[PDB]
A paper describes a structure:
Kif7, a member of the kinesin 4 superfamily, is implicated in a variety of diseases including Joubert, hydrolethalus and acrocallosal syndromes. Members of the kinesin superfamily of motor proteins (Kifs) move unidirectionally along microtubules (MTs) in an ATP-dependent manner. Kif7, a critical regulator of mammalian Hh signalling, acts as both a positive and negative regulator in the Hh signalling pathway but performs this role differently from Cos2 in that it does not interact with Smo or Fu.
In our effort to characterize human kinesins of medical interest, we report here the crystal structure of the human Kif7 motor domain to 1.6 Å resolution. Of the seven Kif7 and Kif27 constructs used for crystallization, only Kif78–347, which lacks the neck linker region, yielded crystals. Data were collected to 1.6 Å resolution and the structure thus belongs to a small group of kinesins solved to a higher resolution. The final structure included residues 12–347 (missing regions: 107–114, 207–211, 230–241, 260–273) with bound Mg2+ADP (octahedrally co­ordinated) in the catalytic site and 328 water molecules. Alignment of Kif78–347 with conventional kinesin (Kif5b) revealed their high structural similarity.
Numbering used by the authors: 9 to 103, 112 to 202, 209 to 226, 239 to 256, 271 to 344
The structure:
């Protein structure tokens, strides 16, 4: 009933603008060996390695589709995109160029239709976290002070003050995403995190599970003073045989608290670490490769 955080690396193509500025690829990517080489000498393996020619459907199948199955069994699941601004986190998460969220939701509604013995309800929330304050992207608006994050006796995360919207189909999900994304604007989204949470309630007793799709703030850098370092500390602890049997340090950030029942342990979690191949990005790409390695 227990599982490790799975780490995928997704390397995007060199963009036309990077090529026109004279940059070249610094990455040799070997997807069928599960590894990459940075520069001459730096080798990194990961559970999944996706090269520049892996399309969106391939990413979804490799990384995500197995989570959707656990979610329907009553497990909590989280997929989060990590990496520097410009590396492809939003393109990947998608919230045939569509990303993970629409693919996962299309499949979820088909599964609901297939399991005809169950009476299922799906509802969604969409939240932004910026400087440890929440904004509810689905609400006409809500004071940050009025949103609170709590935990029940059974260890379940409980949101207070957050709008939950029942959804019966992909079209309704897409409309809510469109609305929330427009509301986000009116502080630079590369600097904030977003969490789209899908809750599935199934009855023959009630079985409730959560699937979080997380597009993180940019990882670029100028102990544990940032939400990304808090997340790193949590996933490092989960991946370390000496630390993983002890208390996992979720309390240090709202991003790890909101995911506390969804991150490692009895839940299923995938981190997609996105990297630019550009030589101009070498240092931040190394940072990302090292961060992702700490989770394994
Ligand atoms: N796998 C990919 N294939 C092609 N283009 C991509 C890929 N990933 C990202 N891009 C492009 O790169 C740019 C940066 O992607 P974006 O998703 O905004 O990054 P981030 O959210 O990490 O800042 C966008 O113009 C996007 O369309
Ligand atoms: Mg983005």
């Amino acid at each position: 009933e227990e599982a490790p955080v799975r780490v995928a690396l997704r390397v995007r193509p060199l963009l036309p603008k990077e090529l026109l500025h004279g940059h070249q690829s610094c990455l040799q990517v070997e997807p069928g060996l599960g590894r990459v080489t940075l520069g001459r000498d730096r080798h990194f393996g990961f559970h999944v390695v996706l090269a520049e020619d892996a399309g969106q459907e391939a990413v979804y199948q490799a990384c995500v589709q197995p989570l959707l199955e656990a979610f329907f069994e009553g497990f909590n699941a989280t997929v989060f995109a990590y990496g520097q601004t410009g590396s492809g986190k939003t393109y990947t998460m998608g919230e045939d160029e569509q990303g993970i969220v629409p693919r996962a939701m299309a499949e979820a509604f088909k599964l609901i239709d297939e399991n005809d013995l169950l009476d299922c309800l799906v509802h969604v929330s969409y939240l932004e976290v910026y400087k440890e304050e929440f904004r509810d992207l689905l609400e006409v608006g809500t004071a940050s002070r009025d949103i609170q994050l709590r935990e029940d006796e059974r260890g379940n995360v409980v949101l207070c003050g957050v709008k939950e919207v029942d959804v019966e189909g992909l079209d309704e999900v897409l409309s809510l995403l469109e609305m929330g994304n427009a509301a986000r604007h009116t502080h630079l989204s590369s600097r904030s995190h977003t969490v789209f949470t899908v809750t599935l309630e199934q009855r023959g007793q009630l079985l409730v599970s959560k699937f979080h799709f997380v597009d993180l703030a940019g990882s670029e850098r100028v102990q544990i003073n940032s939400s990304l370092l808090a997340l790193g500390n949590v996933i490092s602890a989960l991946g370390d045989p000496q630390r993983r049997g002890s208390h996992i340090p979720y309390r240090d950030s709202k991003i790890t608290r909101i995911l506390k029942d969804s991150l490692g342990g009895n839940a299923k979690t995938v981190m997609i670490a996105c990297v630019s191949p550009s030589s101009s990005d070498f240092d931040e790409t190394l940072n990302t490769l090292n961060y992702a390695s700490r989770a394994q």
